[PDB]
Design a protein around this motif. Structure first.
Motif, PDB file in Angstrom:
ATOM      1  N   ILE A   1      74.114  33.359  23.080  1.00  0.00           N
ATOM      2  CA  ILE A   1      73.366  32.841  24.222  1.00  0.00           C
ATOM      3  C   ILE A   1      73.780  31.395  24.460  1.00  0.00           C
ATOM      4  O   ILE A   1      73.670  30.552  23.563  1.00  0.00           O
ATOM      5  N   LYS A   2      74.248  31.106  25.674  1.00  0.00           N
ATOM      6  CA  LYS A   2      74.755  29.786  26.022  1.00  0.00           C
ATOM      7  C   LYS A   2      73.871  29.023  26.997  1.00  0.00           C
ATOM      8  O   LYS A   2      73.812  27.795  26.923  1.00  0.00           O
ATOM      9  N   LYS A   3      73.189  29.714  27.909  1.00  0.00           N
ATOM     10  CA  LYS A   3      72.248  29.077  28.819  1.00  0.00           C
ATOM     11  C   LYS A   3      71.067  30.008  29.044  1.00  0.00           C
ATOM     12  O   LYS A   3      71.203  31.233  28.991  1.00  0.00           O
ATOM     13  N   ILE A   4      69.900  29.417  29.293  1.00  0.00           N
ATOM     14  CA  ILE A   4      68.648  30.164  29.372  1.00  0.00           C
ATOM     15  C   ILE A   4      68.021  29.944  30.742  1.00  0.00           C
ATOM     16  O   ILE A   4      67.826  28.801  31.165  1.00  0.00           O
ATOM     17  N   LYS A   5      67.700  31.034  31.429  1.00  0.00           N
ATOM     18  CA  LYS A   5      67.064  30.952  32.735  1.00  0.00           C
ATOM     19  C   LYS A   5      65.553  30.841  32.578  1.00  0.00           C
ATOM     20  O   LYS A   5      64.958  31.484  31.707  1.00  0.00           O
ATOM     21  N   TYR A   6      64.934  30.018  33.422  1.00  0.00           N
ATOM     22  CA  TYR A   6      63.485  29.876  33.423  1.00  0.00           C
ATOM     23  C   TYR A   6      62.996  29.658  34.849  1.00  0.00           C
ATOM     24  O   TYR A   6      63.776  29.388  35.765  1.00  0.00           O
TER      25      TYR A   6
END
Lengths: 126, 1048
Positions: free
Chosen positions: B872-877
């Motif tokens: 996991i490199k970037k997390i959506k919120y």
RNA sequence: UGAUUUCUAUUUACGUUUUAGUACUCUGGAAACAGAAUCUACUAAAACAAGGCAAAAUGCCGUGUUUC
């Protein structure tokens, strides 16, 4: 929250009370996203007067240099000129008392009335 | 108005131009005002150019892909029924090197090669390194491609590491061409191809534009051929318009700067104080052409003097003497020392031009050979690999040589030579100009800030000339700061030094017990710099005597102010009162060469030298003041001092002065123009007792104007100032009177003539520059996707990057405060539980993911039963609720989510009066579209926004307001900032004479420093006013209907 | 108190988003498989200021200056 749900577009602004800053975010490029909020006295079209807490978000404020205590003033200036030239309205929530809206902005939003205050409190600088 | 006999003072700042009009004979203030504008910034045009280039790159990539598509359709390898969705291009590309490919996968392979085709030359990529330069990555990849094709390496990368794309995917075009032509030589046996097919595809794959070709036909940035390319790249000389500007590092330019350095030297010796023709030639040949960076030691050894005897040289910040270095001469000499090459000035000029304007070793070699010169092929080879040749000179080579003659055969420098020659700008015929042209400023090599302020000042001068007639005198002062950053720098340094001086004064008072030090800061600082020594008698100045009896010691001016005009610290020494009294209107060299002195001049000189050597207690200016051994009664020395301390000799100021004086010279208009040094005006403003703080608005800018205007008055009233008056005006000066003492100097300049009358002036005028430009930034850069929550609102989705950065605590803050905003919280709870476990394990850390990565070597992987989950490199919120926006979902067909961009930038707002209530509709930048000559407001969008505001068809159009237009709301006049809240009918305005922020600060008011107004039933009156460039008000008259067509 | 860099060209690999495939998660199934979710990642194909030209073309323009 102690808010009241209303019809919001026919509302006249009576007195601008306060301007607070809640977040100064670095996008890790030359740009910043500044979240701020306004506390106003307003009169509804029906006659009743409320206290409006209106949140705004100014995105893509370009600042390439590392910000210091000697620098945050210029970042505030660039944020102001970017906000004046664009669109940053998010929403407005209303209260019946000024004390209640001030408490909202104080605790649940963590807003400072100084850009320097917010920069140091969120950790942008010292 | 009525024509007047007046002096015009101009204060040119970075955001303001103040003007002051004073009567020439009565000294009464006729008028005063300020023209206000926004500070120019090179970053605006920078971003414009960068985005234009990026658009060109993307367009040419798409066009290359489409041309390959057309070639495939030509040979029937692509039809309207071909389907390439499931084809993997890497597998097909490596398979086509050994076997027949499907027409579909063959087409897909050719297309995928055409999309990413590698580098031609690294010089074409202006890059900020993923941290390993493209050149180095190409080296690595080509070393890794010794027995492989690009497709094979990419395929094994995909099969092993799972990725092909990223930093390591940087190859060069050569490798792609190799793979493609092998693929083609294999596939031609199975597909009905041509050799023309192969040639066309390889050309499409490897071809791109050069720096000297430019954009295609029809471009306003392009050129017809290489000659127009060169001429547009260089530009034309200001004084000889058909000549092209020289390159910066031409040999003759460096020789010109070096001769300028040599003519500035003042040599103390029995012979001529100035270097002579033979001496300058000897120094150039034996020092500048033998040493890459000449030093003062070598020059002094050449003329057989000592270093201390040579004065008047440029200096580094380390204090070392600086001299021009012949760059191209020593660059070519290190490759070949042949007299036929390095002693050919025009040949070195041509070599420098070719090295500057050409950006390739191969093109440099070709253009060097095309010079049918005496350079060998290996010499050209070595020269093609030189670096550091950039920039264009101000002058053409013609003017450079014309001034080279004056540099060789006179001792004048560039400034004096230009002041004597008085060259006229000929790019525009000043003969047929009815007013001062503003287009000449566009030519100057200057910062955009000073460019904008110079244009504004020229237009202010034009308007003042039209209003009050031709002025008698024009005096100008340019701000010292180059931009707002420089202004903040200077403010910080001044606050720092004030803090330090306050500390020293406070601890002096603490140690000594007397508060007298509070009123002796200048004498105390001079005592500190001189180490408690009276520099004329070298006796000790006890701090206790200075603090008790300060009048036993006096601040003497090293070079008398009647000639030096210097009021700064550099021209001050704390000496004993008797020394100052006996010195009189003389220099230390004259006083200590006299019977009146108590010590020798050489004792004083030795002391001054050793005192200057240590810890910078002496400034170079102060040292060359104290050891000034010239007769200040000589007119040349007085002219030098006036040009240093009274005139502004910065290049921008000199260019503006040359333009103005030329325009007045050509049209035979007798207007004397001078540009005053800002130190002198600061001295005058202080002695005239103007407040240090400027906290009452823009009027200060006008005030300063009047101030310098007043100063100009002085220089015309006294004949004993005539010399100065004629040097500042750059006029040739013919029993002349003269200021003989310092008391007379103070009587002339400190006497507050009409200062109270200037302070009592109240009729200031202000002009704010209105912005009506269409096609500015229309929308923000960030491309957002959105979701629709349970309650029917639309939320914006933000991305969180740098999850494993040492300082990024945003994910920790989000998880601790609002976990539900994460999308994985709702749609992948097990991965979120993994993440929360990691967060709590290192909760006492600022970024727990960073410490987790450093302790385990593992990233956060998506939850897996077999532990094969991806990194996991970037997390959506979830962000905010979607308000007004630009919907760009149509660009992405069948998109399940709405794709948006934010912050629709406004253009203006149109105010209507509808059945007694004031309404207004916001014209956005998106609503204005260019049609073929002119910008047009889209009538459909305009009527849409009108209806959204419930504006009647019978509503009366009142006005249209842009940025900085003058609005009159309920009888009060403000300047328009813009629309603040369109839905709430809220606009933003500001005051005219001062910003609302400082207005609130002066009253110590903590209200929000923004004037937001509502326009609704409560609004009684709305009017529009505008001013000329001088700030003269007039109500806007007409326009029954809004403007739909705009010039641009 | 203590001395010019504007204007402009060419390009690579990224980056954001959508679709499709695959991987990951869940449900059902003996299996063949099919659904659910659209979170995380890879690959490809597209869009990336709104948009406007132009028609096989190393095709062109679109965030600057000036705003009296």
């Amino acid at each position: 929250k102690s808010i009241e749900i209303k019809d919001q577009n026919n509302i006249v602004l009576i007195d601008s009370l306060g301007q607070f800053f809640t977040d100064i975010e670095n996008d890790n490029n030359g740009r910043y996203n500044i979240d701020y909020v306004l506390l106003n006295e307003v009169e509804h079209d029906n006659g009743n007067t409320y206290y409006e807490v209106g949140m705004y978000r100014t995105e893509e404020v370009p600042f390439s240099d590392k910000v210091t205590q000697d620098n945050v003033e210029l970042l505030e200036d660039k944020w102001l000129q970017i906000d004046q030239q664009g669109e940053s309205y998010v929403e407005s929530i209303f209260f019946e008392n000024e004390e209640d809206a001030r408490e909202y902005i104080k605790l649940v939003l963590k807003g400072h009335e100084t850009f320097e205050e917010t920069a140091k409190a969120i950790g942008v600088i010292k | 108005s009525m024509k007047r006999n007046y002096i015009l003072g101009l204060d040119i700042g970075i955001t303001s131009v103040g003007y002051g009009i004073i009567d020439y004979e009565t000294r009464d203030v006729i008028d005063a005002g300020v023209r206000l504008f926004k500070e120019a910034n090179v970053e605006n045009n920078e971003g414009r150019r960068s985005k234009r280039g990026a658009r060109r790159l993307k367009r040419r990539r798409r066009h290359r892909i489409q041309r390959v598509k057309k070639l495939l359709f030509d040979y029937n390898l692509l039809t309207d029924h071909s389907e390439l969705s499931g084809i993997n291009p890497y597998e097909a590309r490596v398979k086509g090197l050994s076997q027949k490919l499907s027409e579909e996968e063959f087409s897909a392979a050719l297309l995928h090669l055409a999309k990413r085709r590698g580098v031609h030359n690294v010089n074409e990529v202006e890059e900020d390194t993923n941290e390993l330069s493209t050149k180095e990555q190409i080296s690595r990849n080509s070393k890794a491609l010794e027995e492989k094709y690009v497709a094979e390496l990419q395929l094994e990368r995909l099969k092993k590491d799972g990725e092909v794309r990223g930093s390591i995917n940087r190859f060069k075009t050569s490798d792609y061409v190799k793979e493609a032509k092998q693929l083609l030589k294999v596939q031609k046996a199975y597909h009905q191809l041509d050799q023309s097919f192969i040639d066309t595809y390889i050309d499409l794959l490897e071809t791109r534009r050069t720096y000297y070709e430019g954009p295609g036909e029809g471009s306003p940035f392009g050129w017809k051929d290489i000659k127009e390319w060169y001429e547009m790249l260089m530009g034309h000389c200001t004084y000889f318009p058909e000549e092209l500007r020289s390159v910066k590092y031409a040999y003759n330019a460096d020789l010109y700067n070096a001769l300028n350095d040599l003519n500035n030297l003042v040599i103390t010796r029995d012979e001529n104080e100035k270097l002579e023709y033979y001496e300058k030639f000897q120094i150039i040949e034996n020092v500048f052409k033998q040493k890459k960076k000449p030093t003062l030691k070598q020059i002094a050894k050449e003329i057989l003097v000592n270093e201390e005897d040579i004065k008047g040289y440029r200096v580094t910040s380390t204090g070392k003497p600086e001299f021009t270095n012949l760059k191209v001469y020593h660059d070519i000499k290190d490759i070949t020392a042949r007299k036929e090459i390095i002693e050919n000035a025009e040949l070195l000029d041509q070599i420098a031009k070719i090295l500057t304007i050409y950006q390739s070793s191969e093109d440099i070699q070709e253009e060097l050979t095309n010079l049918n010169s005496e350079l060998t092929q290996e010499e050209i080879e070595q020269i093609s690999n030189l670096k550091g040749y950039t920039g264009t000179h101000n002058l053409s080579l013609k003017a450079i040589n014309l001034i080279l003659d004056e540099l060789w055969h006179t001792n004048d420098n560039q400034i004096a030579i230009f002041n004597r020659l008085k060259l006229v700008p000929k790019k525009v015929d000043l003969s047929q100009q009815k007013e001062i042209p503003t287009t000449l400023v566009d030519d100057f090599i200057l910062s955009p800030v000073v460019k904008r302020s110079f244009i504004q000042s020229i237009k202010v001068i034009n308007a003042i000339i039209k209003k009050y007639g031709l002025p008698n005198d024009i005096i100008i002062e340019l701000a010292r700061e180059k931009n707002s950053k420089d202004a903040q720098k200077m403010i910080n340094e001044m606050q720092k030094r004030n803090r330090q001086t306050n500390e020293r004064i406070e601890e002096i008072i603490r140690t000594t017990g007397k508060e007298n030090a509070k009123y002796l800061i200048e004498k105390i600082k001079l005592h500190d710099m001189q180490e408690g020594k009276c520099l004329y008698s070298l006796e000790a100045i006890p701090l206790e005597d200075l603090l008790n009896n300060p009048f036993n010691y006096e601040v003497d001016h090293i070079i008398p102010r009647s000639v030096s005009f210097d009021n700064s610290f550099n021209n001050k020494v704390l000496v004993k009162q008797e020394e100052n009294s006996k010195k009189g209107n003389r220099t230390p060299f004259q006083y200590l060469s006299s019977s009146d002195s108590k010590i020798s001049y050489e004792t004083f000189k030795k002391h001054i030298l050793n005192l200057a050597k240590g810890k910078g207690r002496i400034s170079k200016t102060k040292k060359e003041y104290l050891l000034e051994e010239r007769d200040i009664n000589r007119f040349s020395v007085q002219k030098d001092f006036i040009n240093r301390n009274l005139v502004d000799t910065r290049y921008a100021t000199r260019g503006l002065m040359n333009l103005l004086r030329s325009y007045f010279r050509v049209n035979n208009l007798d207007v004397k123009v001078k540009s005053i040094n800002g130190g002198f005006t600061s001295f005058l403003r202080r002695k005239w007792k103007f407040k240090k703080e400027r906290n009452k608005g823009y009027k200060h800018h006008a005030e300063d104007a009047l101030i310098i205007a007043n100063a100009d008055f002085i220089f015309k009233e006294w004949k004993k100032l005539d010399k100065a008056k004629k040097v500042m005006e750059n006029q040739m000066f013919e029993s002349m009177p003269e200021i003989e003492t310092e008391q007379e100097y103070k009587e002339i300049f400190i006497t507050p003539h009409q200062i109270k009358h200037i302070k009592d002036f109240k009729d200031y005028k202000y002009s704010h520059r209105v912005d009506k430009k269409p096609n500015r930034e229309l929308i923000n850069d960030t491309l957002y996707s959105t979701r629709k929550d349970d309650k029917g609102n639309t939320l914006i989705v933000n991305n969180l990057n740098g999850l494993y950065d040492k300082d990024n605590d945003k994910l920790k803050k989000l998880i601790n405060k609002s976990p539900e905003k994460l999308l994985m919280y709702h749609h992948d709870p097990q991965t979120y539980q993994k993440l929360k476990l990691i967060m709590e394990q290192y909760g006492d850390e600022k970024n727990p993911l960073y410490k987790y990565y450093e302790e385990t070597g593992n990233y956060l992987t998506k939850y897996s039963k077999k532990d094969n989950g991806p990194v996991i490199k970037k997390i959506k919120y979830y962000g905010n609720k979607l308000n007004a926006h630009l919907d760009i979902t149509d660009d992405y067909p069948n998109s399940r989510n709405k794709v948006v961009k934010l912050s629709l930038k406004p253009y203006r707002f149109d105010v209507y009066l509808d059945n007694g209530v004031y309404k207004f509709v916001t014209v956005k930048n998106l609503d204005v579209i260019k049609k073929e000559n002119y910008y047009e407001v889209n009538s459909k969008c305009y009527e849409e926004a009108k209806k959204l505001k419930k504006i009647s068809n019978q509503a009366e159009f009142i006005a249209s307001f842009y940025n900085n237009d003058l609005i009159k709301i309920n009888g009060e006049l403000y300047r328009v900032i813009g629309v603040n809240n369109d839905l709430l009918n809220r606009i933003e305005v500001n005051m005219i004479d001062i910003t609302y922020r400082e207005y609130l600060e002066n009253m110590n008011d903590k209200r929000p420093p923004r004037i937001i107004k509502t326009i609704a039933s409560k609004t009684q009156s709305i009017k529009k006013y505008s001013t000329d460039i001088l700030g003269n008000l007039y109500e806007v008259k007409s326009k029954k209907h809004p403007q739909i067509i705009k010039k641009g």
